[PDB]
Symmetry: C2
Subunit: 113 residues, 2 copies
């Protein structure tokens, strides 16, 4: 089971972006998948964890009410919907489970230009 991030890009403050975490090798319908983020020279952080059958999704304090994790089982993909973007959301975003690599991640840049 491997996970590939995409969908990151440039946004303005207040903007929206949806990140994708595409699974291969197995199905992620039943497993908790985490989103994490990091800026160079700073600590990696937890962002959110998807629901399971026995658990609801959870979110880091700084993103509560702004981000939403969702799944598309048919596409074997986990999303991170981002809204109300802030310059401090600028980071490389990674999806992972305890059994996967961190991955290449996807870069998000929230900028005034």
């Amino acid at each position: 089971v491997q996970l590939v991030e995409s969908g990151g890009g440039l946004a303005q403050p207040g903007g929206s972006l949806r990140l994708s975490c595409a699974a291969s090798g197995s199905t992620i319908s039943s497993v908790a998948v985490g989103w994490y983020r990091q800026t160079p020279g700073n600590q990696r952080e937890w962002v959110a964890t998807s629901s399971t059958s026995s658990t609801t999704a959870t979110y880091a304090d700084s993103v509560k009410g702004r981000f939403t994790i969702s799944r598309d089982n048919a596409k074997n993909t986990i999303y991170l919907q981002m809204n109300s973007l802030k310059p401090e959301d600028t980071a490389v975003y990674y999806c992972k489970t305890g059994l996967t690599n961190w991955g290449r991640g996807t870069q998000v840049t929230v900028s005034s230009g």
Copy 2:
């Protein structure tokens, strides 16, 4: 402020569908938006309510862990992501706030063919 539903269609059991609720006339970034559903000759039901700034999203018992509401503020749109579809999810789905009409709704058909 008016809301238009789309994205409904045919799915197999276990399938996935994402419904869209597109707003016009105003922005829905700060307001709670509900999803509801109904089959002909049966009672309309509540399905889920979106988050606000002071409230987390909530879900009806029969859809918990299977559906997820999310927003795209840039598109002024609310989604209902559906997974693990069941024949009983067959219904016309409506989005609404206390200040809108029910709308034309969008039909979802979960079928064996």
